[PDB]
Structures are given as C-alpha cells and as structure tokens.
Nucleic acid binder design. Sequence first.
DNA 1: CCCGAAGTCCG
DNA 2: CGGACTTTCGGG
Length: 231
Amino acid sequence: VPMHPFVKALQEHFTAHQNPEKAEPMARYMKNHFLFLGIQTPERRQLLKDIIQIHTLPDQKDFQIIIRELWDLPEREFQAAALDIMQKYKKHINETHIPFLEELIVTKSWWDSVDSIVPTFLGDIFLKHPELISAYIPKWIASDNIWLQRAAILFQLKYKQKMDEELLFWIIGQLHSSKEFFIQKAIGWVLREYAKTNPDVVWEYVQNNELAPLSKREAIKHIKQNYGINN
DNA sequence: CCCGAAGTCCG
DNA sequence: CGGACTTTCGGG
Ligand SMILES: Cc1cnc(N)c2[nH]cnc12
C-alpha cells in the first residue's frame, strides 16, 4: 500500500525547496536528533498551503493516516507540517483521540513537537473533559518517558483562571526531584505562566516547597520584581 | 512594530 | 549556578 498522494505531493514539494545550508544549523539546534530539509516556518506553511490548494485537504477519514505517514518521514519539517495539518482538523479531535496524541508525544519526541501537542490539543481536551485527567496523568507521571511527564506538567499551561491549582501543585510535587532538564524547565514554565494569573500563590509555592534551582529561578523570573529580593 | 516563549558562551 | 545574549516563532 503506497503513501497517501497528499503526503507524496507534500514530500516532493518540500524537497524541491530544501536548503542544506540552513538545515545544518537547524539540525544542531535540535541537538542533531533529526534530519532537516532546511525550510523555516513561513515558507513551510506556504508550501503546505500550495499542496492544499492543488489537492484539497484529505477527507477526515484519512486524518490520522496522513499524520502518521508524515510522522514516519525522516525530516523534521514533516512532523511540523503534520502538526499544522492537525490544526486544520481541530474541530474533529475529541477525547477519543487521547491515545493517538500520546503516541505522537512518545514518537520522534523533542520539545518542538511535544510543546505543540500538549498545551493546545491535550489542554483543550482535558478542559472539556476534566474527568478524564485521572485516567492519564497518573500513568504519565509514573512513565519512564520524560515527554509524558512533561505532558502532565504542561497540559494546563494556558488554563489561566481555569487552572486546577491543587492538581498543578500535586503534579509538580511528584516531579520536583527529577534531574531531567526538560522536566525542571517545564515546571519553571508552567509556574511562570500561571503566575501571570495568580502571582501570590506561585510565590508562596516556590518559597515554601522544594524545587530544582532552575525551576524556581524560571518560575519567578518576572514576579520577583513584585515581591523583591531579600538581603 | 512590540514583547515573551529553546540555544551558546562565560564567569 | 545564573546572567548575557542568540535566532525563530506566536501574538498583541
Ligand atoms: C523558547 C525560547 C525562549 N526564549 C528565547 N529567547 C527563544 N528564542 C527562540 N526560542 C526561545
């Protein structure tokens, strides 16, 4: 069974505009975990738009198939394009897609893909179906996979006043001893971001609970101005 | 335009 | 460690 014609077309069109000179520093930026064609986002989005204009967006029955096929291609631009395409099918994504999204998180994993899946797609799903959080978050925290652990931390990133504070701090407490940069930094990020909504609670949390130095520093990057730095 | 959100380099 | 500074992306 051949690849979907939409994916074959995208592959051909992206490859025709590859830039090996840019691809080298792009690959180094991602610590050489991926091959790159060398196409940056504004052009990549236009090339995708070209293929949609010519071929039309594939029927929804093929949505997951298209995403997986792009996920399996070597160059990182194809996963970036897959995420652009998933945004176009956004109105069709629901709680039944959580395992599909899990699998994307733990394949071809790095911060660029995981941070584009978690606070947006998963965040939206768990906002609508909070009763399902406990069907996934404990497993993710207990996982060997740091990207699932990061997912547990960041799915609430954009919740603002809908933040479940008790949940947030419980998750952070479970992971606060991790020596993994991407976990320490995610804790810092979600605290920094939530501090834009409720700075008092974040300040109290970081002053009174154990965190990695990186996590605490990133959490209070802005709000330390509001409280001051004691002698 | 602006600002806020990985990377290298250097005490 | 944490500050100084980098490019790229998203959004106001
Ligand atoms: C994630 C992130 C944070 N700060 C910056 N200055 C960045 N530049 C590119 N990505 C960045």
